[PDB]
Amino acid sequence: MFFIKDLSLNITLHPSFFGPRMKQYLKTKLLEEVEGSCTGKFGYILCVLDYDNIDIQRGRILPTDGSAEFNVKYRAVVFKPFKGEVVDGTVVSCSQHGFEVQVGPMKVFVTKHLMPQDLTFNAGSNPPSYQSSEDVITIKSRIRVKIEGCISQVSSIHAIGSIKEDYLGAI
Template sequence: MPPRRLGIVVVGLQARHKPSCLTLAAMFFIKELTHTILLHPSYFGPRMLNFLESKLYADVEGTCSGQFGYIIAVVSILDIGKGMVLSGSGQAEFITRYRAIVFKPFKGEVVDGVVSNVNKMGFFADVGPLQVFVSHQLIHPDLKFDSNSNPPSFASADQIIEKSTHVRLKIVGTRVDATEIFAIGTIKEDHLGVL
């Protein structure tokens, strides 16, 4: 299988090498991970390795692990272990080691996002795979909710926040579940808000 090209460009950042983690930016990391693949006996054969590789990509890319964050892309497969046949089912279990780009937000980081939903309580912004909620209490007091506008928006004399608006916000808190990350942000500080 030819190597896959990733549509990722990192400009002006210096990477620092760590034993199992390469830092691309404050919230993007290259991390060594493992994944267990169960393979049905019908896939045993000459193309088994290709199937294991494509199954690894399908299983892990785009998923979220509370411990490591969102797995954006598999960069390389380091090792596909020897399969162990499970008694009773005939399936083989393969433990694979791979290197992946992961996205994990941290408190205090400033990020750019696109507003996806606005209501009187605040708005939601999508920052890649992460959805950030900005409460009306963490929005600058000049921006007032306009319930009569269509679509709903927060507006001031010179700015308007509505669906599809690009905003810069600061993450003030995160909550990590087993399969999802939740974040709360603010645009109440200097240099934050509509881009």
């Protein structure tokens, strides 16, 4: 599931930082504008590998202010869920409408009606939970869900998944 996609970002550097340790401030800002990003087209940008060999190429000077623009080519580790994918994470919150599991940087939620019937919701519980014949799901409980659909937004991606198929539940 996780990926290592080849990306490239364009940064406009102000003449100010046209010093000797520029390559440095260039890189440094790349990392401030990438690691932690989130697109619907790349999902979660998590980390730039091979720091030492980032390519800056020659930047060209814009023409009204000194600012030079470099097309920084790099490579890094990303992860964007998919519909019909199967991953397992740890549940975090849980209410009368379901629990929300946390696969990585992301958060997948499961409807009270996307699980099995012989699994109810226990209100008078501490912490809040869902009981079964032999199973009991709450906070720390490790689940394994099937991501039904994804909805990208802002700088995060949410998705709803089910546990009504087979081999889906606790572990």
